[PDB]
């Protein structure tokens, strides 16, 4: 059982959310130093994902709606190690705009990072509502990295994501890096790692990969170029259905952009029931299109 109705923060409209977007964008541009000049984009995208990937379609627990990331249990999920940097980034934003709900902020963080790293436009809907600490999902709902194509397919079923949606979402691994201290994995995925492109499929197909044990004793695929791939990233080219989708995004950047946009909003809106007269989704202007 369990229904979560989108309630619009009172009196709020498009241009209020545009200003929250603009603050995020502005600080993305300003704290350009973090994670050796990668900046905060990647970790905000991942935050926006980890707050949504707790969802379970079966009983409708977890997901982005309740902002339950603010509570110690989920905050200290070992799957979330590193994500405290994104939370702290969003901290002065929440103080400047305390009317916005936690859910809405975390997911807007991701949308803003993507668009500002030159990725697709992702429509976004407000309306998530903080729920209480006892609504916080337990740890272990987010996927393991050490597993195969079969594990991946099964995992994302619980998020109601198909082959195509999964391959699309995964191309976000073009962004940022694994960090040994955070996940037991080390290295970037490509050369353009704070620009949102389809470089993750290009690298899967084009680099020369070798399975190795890393310094945390974990297996990961490394290339002569110094890029890496998680066994789970790598399964996308071992499975015949996934491979064929990898080659399609490798050859069609527009296509990748559109499917990633669809599946990213679907990820962030899983679990949430929008009333028939909720506002339409907002497509925010980037700093650049506002000349800001």
Name the pairing type of β-strands 228-229 and 209-213: unpaired
- Taking residues 258 to 287 in sequence order and writing x for each that binds ligand 285 by CB under 6 A, - otherwise, the string is ------------------------------
* Contact call for residues 68 and 131 (beta carbons, < 8 A): yes
Expressed in percent and rounded to 5, the helix, strand and coil fractions of the chain are 50, 10, 45
Q: Which does 237 bind (CB under 5 to 8 A by kind): ligand HEM, ligand 285, none?
A: none
* Contact call for residues 25 and 287 (beta carbons, < 8 A): yes
Q: Which does 189 bind (CB under 5 to 8 A by kind): ligand 285, ligand HEM, none?
A: ligand 285
Q: Which residues bind ligand HEM (CB under 6 A)?
A: 42-43, 45-46, 49, 82, 143, 145, 152, 169-170, 172-173, 175-179, 182-183, 185, 230, 232
Q: Is 128 in the site for ligand 285 (CB under 6 A)?
A: no
Subset of residues 53 to 92 that bind ligand 285, contact rule: CB under 6 A: none
Distance of CA 226 to the CA centre of its chain: 24
Reference 287, options 112, 100, 46, 120; nearest CA is 112
Subset of residues 197 to 216 that bind ligand 285, contact rule: CB under 6 A: 200
- Name which of 113 and 229 has its Cβ closer to ligand 285: 229
Subset of residues 106 to 125 that bind ligand 285, contact rule: CB under 6 A: none
* Contact call for residues 266 and 165 (beta carbons, < 8 A): yes
Q: Is 152 in the site for ligand 285 (CB under 6 A)?
A: no
CB neighbour list of residue 262: distance below 8 Å, 6 or more residues apart: 165, 168
Which of 63, 189, 231, 271 touches ligand 285 by CB under 6 A? 189
* Contact call for residues 20 and 27 (beta carbons, < 8 A): no
The binding site for ligand 285 (CB under 6 A) comprises 173, 176-178, 188-189, 200, 228-230, 233
């Amino acid at each position: 059982t369990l229904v979560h109705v989108a309630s619009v923060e009172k009196g709020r409209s498009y241009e209020d959310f545009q200003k929250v977007y603009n603050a995020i964008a502005l600080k993305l541009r300003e704290d350009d130093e973090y994670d050796n000049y990668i900046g905060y984009g990647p970790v905000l995208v991942r935050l926006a994902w980890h707050i949504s990937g707790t969802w379970d379609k079966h009983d409708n627990t977890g997901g982005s709606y309740g902002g339950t990331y603010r509570f110690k249990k989920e905050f200290n999920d070992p799957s979330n190690a590193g994500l405290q940097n994104g939370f702290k980034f969003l901290e002065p934003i929440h103080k400047e705009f305390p009317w916005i709900s936690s859910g809405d902020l975390f997911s807007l963080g991701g949308v803003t990072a993507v668009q500002e790293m030159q990725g697709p436009k992702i429509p976004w809907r407000c309306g998530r509502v903080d729920t209480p600490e006892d609504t916080t999902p337990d740890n272990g709902r987010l996927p393991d990295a050490d597993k195969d194509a079969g594990y991946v397919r099964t995992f994302f079923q619980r998020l109601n994501m198909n082959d195509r949606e999964v391959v699309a979402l995964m191309g976000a691994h073009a962004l940022g890096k694994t960090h040994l201290k955070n996940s037991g994995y080390e290295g970037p995925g490509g050369a353009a790692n704070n620009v949102f492109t389809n470089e993750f499929y290009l690298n899967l197909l084009n680099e020369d990969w070798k399975l190795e044990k890393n310094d945390a004793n974990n297996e990961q695929w490394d290339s002569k170029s110094g890029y890496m791939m998680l066994p789970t990233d790598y399964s996308l080219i071992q499975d015949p259905k996934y491979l064929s989708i990898v080659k399609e995004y490798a050859n069609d950047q527009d296509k990748f952009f559109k499917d990633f946009s669809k599946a990213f909003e679907k990820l962030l809106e899983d679990g949430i029931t929008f009333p028939k007269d909720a506002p339409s989704p907002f497509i925010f202007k980037t700093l650049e299109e506002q000349g800001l």
